[PDB]
RNA sequence: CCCCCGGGGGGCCGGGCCACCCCUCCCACGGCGCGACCGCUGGGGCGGACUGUCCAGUGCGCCCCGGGCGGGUCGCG
């Protein structure tokens, strides 16, 4: 009751750094596809 | 006020403009050439992330570019 006020917390800059991971983009998502189907054949006439 | 045959015609002197040929402004429009500002799509380096049942591959960040493409705005010839 007698210093109800609130003082926040003093901000200081940070180094801008990343822990999430980013979205993955198309063109990585649409070559992945190629790489999985390739690898998929050169895998098989391994077995041929 | 004159002139040619009472009726038809011809002039009076100044000024500016367009006709032709010379020169040259600003503007409009179109064309060709060039330069500047924006847009799009090849290289290299750096940094980082990711993918692929062979070491290969794929974006993103920064920077430098040789460009290519295209339109707008601006400025010339």
Request: no cysteine; proline share 6%.
């Amino acid at each position: 009751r007698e210093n109800p006020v609130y003082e926040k917390k003093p901000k200081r800059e940070v180094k801008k750094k990343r822990w999430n991971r980013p979205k993955m983009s198309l063109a990585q998502k649409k070559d992945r596809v190629a790489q999985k189907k390739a690898s998929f054949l050169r895998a098989q006439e391994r077995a041929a």
